[PDB]
């Protein structure tokens, strides 16, 4: 099944392309052959500061008819800088502007943490210490609601909440919208299992980022764990004839999370696809879910200071 339920009605393809750190030389490309294989599903963000392309390879396949606007599903997150309630319609008509849509089909805050607002994406002071703004989450999330209640977007949600986080907003007086998603890391060096108990039994779907253990973060160790070259997960692959990468997304799928992997490799993008074809056994998915080493791909020390720093929470 392709598409999960949210709590606005619409169906959300359980499978969609990543595009952070997608060059703006690369990503137009990597769009229209994803659309070509199938994706509906793409993840942008305008931190990512590759929106114009991704709309460009958008719009043209619109224009090839290849595919409606209807039967694509485009999500944008609102960065740290824009948190303050008077800059939030501003960021979603950037990005709107940028990927030349009318709507969003799913807005998200992109991370609890509301920075300085200006130019710069990571404002820092000197100690490596991120500036903070005055803004907290709920004044945010007013912020959001009222994107839906304008039609710019058709839902909205969260990214990198913990369980706490999640809780403030349900628990918000005179809430508008439910959040529909919470889209935070997931591999089998970071299983989420709490977390992701507590947002389904809440009604609020899972995205699974850096599904592939993001080998291209640009802040890696070499003595970082690598997922994709893990003998374990490898030997689980061959036994399925699927690649590393297939078994890596696969996973989550069976755990009804939605995934987002990326790639700008034509033969990848492609190959990423193909997961509707297998399915991982039981020893499988208990042998994946052992692997859990509460390993984090996006978690900054330049935050950990920060009064919503995600993290400090066991979930
Ligand atoms: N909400 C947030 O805070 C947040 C944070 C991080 C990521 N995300 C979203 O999640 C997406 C996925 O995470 P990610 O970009 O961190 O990393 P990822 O999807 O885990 O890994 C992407 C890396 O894997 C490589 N790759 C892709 N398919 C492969 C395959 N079949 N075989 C071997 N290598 C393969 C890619 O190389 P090539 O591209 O060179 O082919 C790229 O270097 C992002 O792009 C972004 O959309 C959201
Ligand atoms: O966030 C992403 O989607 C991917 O990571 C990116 C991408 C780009 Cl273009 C620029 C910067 C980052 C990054 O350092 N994100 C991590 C991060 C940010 C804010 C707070 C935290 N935090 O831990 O409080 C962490």
New binding site residues.
């Given amino acids: 099944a392709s598409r999960i339920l949210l709590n606005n009605g619409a169906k959300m393809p359980i499978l969609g392309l990543?595009?952070?750190?997608?060059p703006p030389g690369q990503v137009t490309e990597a769009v229209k052959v994803a659309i070509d294989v199938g994706y509906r599903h793409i993840?942008c963000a305008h931190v990512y500061q590759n929106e114009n392309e991704v709309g460009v390879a958008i719009q043209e396949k619109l224009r090839e008819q290849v595919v409606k606007r209807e039967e694509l599903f485009i999500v944008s997150?609102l960065w740290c800088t824009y948190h303050e309630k008077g800059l939030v319609k501003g960021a979603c008509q950037k990005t709107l502007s940028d990927l030349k849509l009318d709507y969003l089909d799913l807005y998200?805050i992109?991370?609890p943490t509301g920075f300085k607002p200006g130019k710069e994406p990571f404002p820092l002071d000197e100690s490596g210490n991120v500036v903070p703004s005055d803004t907290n989450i709920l004044d945010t999330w007013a912020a959001m609601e009222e994107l839906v209640d304008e039609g710019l977007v058709k839902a909205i949600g969260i990214?990198?909440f913990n369980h706490l986080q999640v809780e403030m907003i349900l628990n918000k007086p005179g809430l508008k919208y439910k959040p529909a998603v919470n889209?935070i890391?997931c591999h089998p060096y970071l299983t989420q299992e709490k977390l992701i108990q507590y947002c389904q039994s809440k009604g609020i779907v899972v995205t699974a980022?850096?599904?592939?253990?993001?080998?291209?973060?640009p802040w890696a160790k070499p003595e970082d764990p690598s997922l994709?070259e893990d003998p374990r997960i490898k030997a689980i692959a061959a036994k399925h004839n699927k690649?590393t990468?297939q078994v890596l997304i696969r996973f989550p799928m069976q755990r009804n999370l939605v995934v987002?992997?990326?790639?700008?490799?034509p033969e990848?993008i492609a190959?990423?696809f193909k997961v509707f074809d297998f399915e991982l056994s039981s020893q499988d998915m208990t042998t994946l879910l052992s692997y859990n080493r509460n390993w984090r791909?996006?978690a900054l020390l330049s935050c950990t200071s920060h009064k919503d720093y995600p993290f400090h929470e066991e979930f």
């Fill in positions: 990543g595009t952070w750190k997608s993840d997150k998200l992109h991370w990214s990198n889209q890391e980022y850096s599904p592939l253990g993001s080998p291209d973060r994709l690649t990468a987002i992997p990326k790639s700008v490799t990848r190959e990423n791909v996006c």
